[PDB]
Amino acid sequence: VGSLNCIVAVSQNMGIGKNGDLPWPPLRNEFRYFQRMTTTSSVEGKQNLVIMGKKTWFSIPEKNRPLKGRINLVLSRELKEPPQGAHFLSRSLDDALKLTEQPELANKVDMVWIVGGSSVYKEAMNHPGHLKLFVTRIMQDFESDTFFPEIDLEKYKLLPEYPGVLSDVQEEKGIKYKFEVYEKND
Numbered sequence: 258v259g260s261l262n263c264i265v266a267v268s269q270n271m272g273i274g275k276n277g278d279l280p281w282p283p284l285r286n287e288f289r290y291f292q293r294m295t296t297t298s299s300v301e302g303k304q305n306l307v308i309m310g311k312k313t314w315f316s317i318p319e320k321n322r323p324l325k326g327r328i329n330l331v332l333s334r335e336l337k338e339p340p341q342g343a344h345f346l347s348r349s350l351d352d353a354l355k356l357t358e359q360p361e362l363a364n365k366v367d368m369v370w371i372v373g374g375s376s377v378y379k380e381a382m383n384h385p386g387h388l389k390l391f392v393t394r395i396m397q398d399f400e401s402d403t404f405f406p407e408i409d410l411e412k413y414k415l416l417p418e419y420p421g422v423l424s425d426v427q428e429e430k431g432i433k434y435k436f437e438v439y440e441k442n443d
């Protein structure tokens with residue numbers, strides 16, 4: 258119903274996962290950023306929707322599923338029902354977005370947040386219309402087996418600052434990182 262957004266943390270070499278976990282150790286303030294961004298609704302009375310692929314769902318600690326305070330939707334072409342704990346299942350991003358337009362979610366959902374994995378990000382990034390990418394740049398190389406798609410920097414523009422997002426380099430566990438926001442109006 259509201260805006261469509263992707264949110265990701267990436268290493269310099271564009272890595273987002275290794276062996277089903279993040280490639281870096283837990284960065285607690287970065288996690289809190291993810292939590293604040295995906296949970297905070299712009300409309301009182303509504304929740305945000307988080308959309309994620311099957312492997313991403315199972316990469317969330319069981320104790321944290323479903324992500325509290327958000328509506329959790331899993332994408333999968335083979336699952337018959339959503340994995341235990343998930344609220345919805347769709348076969349594709351387009352089907353998920355259509356679902357948000359139906360009466361069951363139309364008055365329940367505010368923002369839509371895409372939270373991975375790679376194929377889901379790629380699909381979202383190319384989807385027509387206004388889209389924002391909330392990218393945490395982890396300023397180190399990390400061995401990774403899963404990567405974020407390349408961002409077309411003509412098509413997307415980096416916003417110089419963004420309300421509610423810190424601009425300075427952050428550091429936790431000796432790992433420096435910075436929060437970035439990209440936008441297309443497409």
Ligand SMILES: NC(=O)c1ccc[n+]([C@@H]2O[C@H](COP(=O)([O-])OP(=O)(O)OC[C@H]3O[C@@H](n4cnc5c(N)ncnc54)[C@H](OP(=O)(O)O)[C@@H]3O)[C@@H](O)[C@H]2O)c1
Nearest residue numbers: 265266273274277278310311312313333334335373374375
């Ligand atoms: N650093 C980050 O911000 C970030 C973000 C997200 C994930 N990750 C990491 O990346 C890894 C998991 O991500 P992933 O890329 O491997 O997988 P994923 O997309 O979460 O899951 C792959 C499965 O999801 C389903 N799926 C994915 N895209 C679909 C689509 N467009 N339409 C229909 N179904 C779709 C497919 O299920 P079916 O085979 O059942 O059809 C596919 O087998 C983990 O290591 C996780 O920690 C990192």
Ligand SMILES: Nc1nc(=O)c2c([nH]1)NC[C@@H](CCc1ccc(C(=O)N[C@@H](CCC(=O)O)C(=O)O)cc1)C2
Nearest residue numbers: 264265266288291292316317318321324372373393
């Ligand atoms: N900015 C940013 N940082 C990140 O760590 C991630 C994303 N974006 N996007 C994708 C995400 C990978 C999938 C994932 C999503 C959520 C969680 C999770 O346990 N979330 C909880 C705790 C906070 C957290 O661990 O991020 C929550 O939101 O309440 C664990 C894994 C990891």
